[PDB]
Amino acid sequence: TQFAFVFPGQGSQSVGMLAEMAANYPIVEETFAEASAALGYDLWALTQQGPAEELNKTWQTQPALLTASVALWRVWQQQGGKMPALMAGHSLGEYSALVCAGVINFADAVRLVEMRGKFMQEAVPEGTGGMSAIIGLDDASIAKACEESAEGQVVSPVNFNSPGQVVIAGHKEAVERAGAACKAAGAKRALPLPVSVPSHCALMKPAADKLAVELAKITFSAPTVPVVNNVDVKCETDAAAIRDALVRQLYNPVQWTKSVEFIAAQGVEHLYEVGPGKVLTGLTKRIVDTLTASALNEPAALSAALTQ
Numbered sequence: 413t414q415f416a417f418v419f420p421g422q423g424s425q426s427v428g429m430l431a432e433m434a435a436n437y438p439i440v441e442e443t444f445a446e447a448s449a450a451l452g453y454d455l456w457a458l459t460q461q462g463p464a465e466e467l468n469k470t471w472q473t474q475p476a477l478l479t480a481s482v483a484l485w486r487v488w489q490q491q492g493g494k495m496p497a498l499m500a501g502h503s504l505g506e507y508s509a510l511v512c513a514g515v516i517n518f519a520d521a522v523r524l525v526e527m528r529g530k531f532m533q534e535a536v537p538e539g540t541g542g543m544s545a546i547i548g549l550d551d552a553s554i555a556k557a558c559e560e561s562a563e564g565q566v567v568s569p570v571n572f573n574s575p576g577q578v579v580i581a582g583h584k585e586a587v588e589r590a591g592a593a594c595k596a597a598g599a600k601r602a603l604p605l606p607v608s609v610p611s612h613c614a615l616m617k618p619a620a621d622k623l624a625v626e627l628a629k630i631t632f633s634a635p636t637v638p639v640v641n642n643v644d645v646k647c648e649t650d651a652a653a654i655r656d657a658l659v660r661q662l663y664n665p666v667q668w669t670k671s672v673e674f675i676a677a678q679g680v681e682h683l684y685e686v687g688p689g690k691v692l693t694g695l696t697k698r699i700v701d702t703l704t705a706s707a708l709n710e711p712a713a714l715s716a717a718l719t720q
Contacts, residue, residue: 413494413495414497414680414681414682415496415497415680415681415682415684416496416497416498416499416500416675416680416682416683416684417496417498417499417509417512417683417684417686418499418500418501418502418505418672418683418684418685418686418692418705419481419499419500419501419502419504419505419506419508419509419512419685419687419692420477420481420501420502420505420685420687420688420689420691420692421477421501421502421503421505422470422474422477422503422504422607422611423605423691424477424687424689424691424692425459425467425468425473425476425477425480425688425689426464426688426689427462427463427464427467428459429459429476429480429688429689429709430459430480430483430484430688430709431460432710432711433483433484433487433709433710433711433714434456435711436487436711437487437490439483439486440483440484440486441456443479443482443483443486444456444459444479444483446518446519446522447475447478447479447518447519447522449519450519450523451475451522451523451526455475455476455479458472458476459476459480469533470529470532470533470607470609471526471527471529471530471533472526472529473529474504474507474525474526474528474529475525475526475529477504477505477508477687477688478507478508478511478521478522478525479522480687480688481505481508481512481686481687482508482511482512482518482521484686484687484709484714485512485686487714488686488708488714488718491718493717496637496684497638497678497680498637498638498639498675498678498680499512499637499638499639499640500639500640500641500642500671500672500675501639501642502571502642502666502691502692503571503611503612503642503661503666504525504528505687506639506641506642506658506661507521507524507525507528507658508521508686508687509639510635510639510658512686513635513636513637513638514634514635514636515632515633515634515635515639515651515654516630516632516633517631520630520631524626524630527622527623527626528619528623528662531622531623532609532611533608534619535609535610535615535616535617535618535619536610538608539584539608540583540584541581541582541583541584541587541608541609541610541615542581542582542583542584542587542605542608543570543579543580543581543607543609543611544579544580544581544587544588544590544591544602544604544605545577545578545579545580545601545602545603545605546569546577546578546579546580546591546594546599546601547576547599547601547602547603548576548598548599548600548601549576549594549597549598549599550575551569551572551578553594553597553598553599554569554578554580554590554594554597554599555569556597557590557593557594557596558580558586558590558593560593561586561589561590561592561593562582562586562590563586563589565582565583565585565586566581566582566583566586566610566613566614567580567581567582567586567589567590567613568580568581568582568614568665569665570610570611570612570613570665571611571612571665571666571668572665572666572667572668572669572670573666573668573669573695574668574669574699575669575698575699576698577695577698580594581610581615582610582613582615583610583615587604587610590602611662612661612662612663612664612665614663615663617663619662619663620663623659624655624659627655627658627659628655632651632654632655633651634649635649635654639654640671640674640675641654641657641658641661642666642667642668642671643657643661643664643665643666643667644657645667645670645671645674646674668692668695668699669695669699672695672696672699672700672703673699673700675703676700676702676703680703681703682703682705682706683696683703683705684705684707684708685705685707685708685709686708687707687709688709689709692705693705693706
């Protein structure tokens with residue numbers, strides 16, 4: 413086919429997410445019921461009632477996001493939707509893609525990402541880390557501002573979301589210094605994210621070590637749909653290969669801009685965002701303007717996408 417499926421991560425959750433899709437297809441709440449049975453609490457109720465402060469806790473956000481994406485995948489299949497040529501995910505999103513591609517058992521994945529969130533949250537002492545979105549400054553300048561600002565601490569470009577949108581992370585003070593340096597180098601803005609965990613940088617090392625232990629116990633099967641990982645920007649099929657990329661993903665940058673450039677290089681013409689929100693959808697044209705993108709979280713939109 414001429415489309416790929418892309419899966420979003422932290423930031424795309426919202427209270428009330430998938431409410432209309434759930435009204436359209438009972439399989440949405442059934443999928444969440446399966447996750448809820450593995451988690452020991454009503455995941456659907458949490459996404460619908462919140463409060464946002466709870467849904468935003470990473471060990472709850474991750475299963476909520478994975479489940480939401482798997483639910484849309486199941487709706488797509490139920491209605492006869494064809495298989496994408498390739499899949500890709502943004503951090504947590506990679507797990508969604510791996511579940512949809514048949515590599516990891518859904519309940520296993522739900523338990524896995526819950527732990528992933530817990531490990532990440534404990535990596536560093538409360539309030540010592542930070543992430544900031546740098547807007548309107550080239551990758552070279554951002555890297556230079558980070559090097560100048562590190563002063564022995566950690567601060568690196570960690571999410572390459574698009575040209576003009578790079579999230580940096582590390583020790584909070586280093587991130588505050590790097591943001592200011594980025595602005596002085598021409599950045600339009602430096603916007604701290606609402607997360608307290610410095611994802612995708614060296615400080616996640618301990619979390620990655622614990623995750624690798626838990627991942628080693630989960631049976632990885634052969635993918636029935638190809639998945640390009642965001643840490644190396646390539647497709648792996650060997651379980652050990654997929655695992656190690658997941659381990660390394662946690663403390664290495666998400667090369668989203670390169671992953672989308674790679675998808676376009678394969679000849680894919682359209683990206684469908686399989687999850688809540690329209691985050692990935694928005695980045696697409698900024699990365700490769702020959703692509704089109706749309707989200708699959710609204711009933712009318714999913715209905716239209718099937719018809720072609």
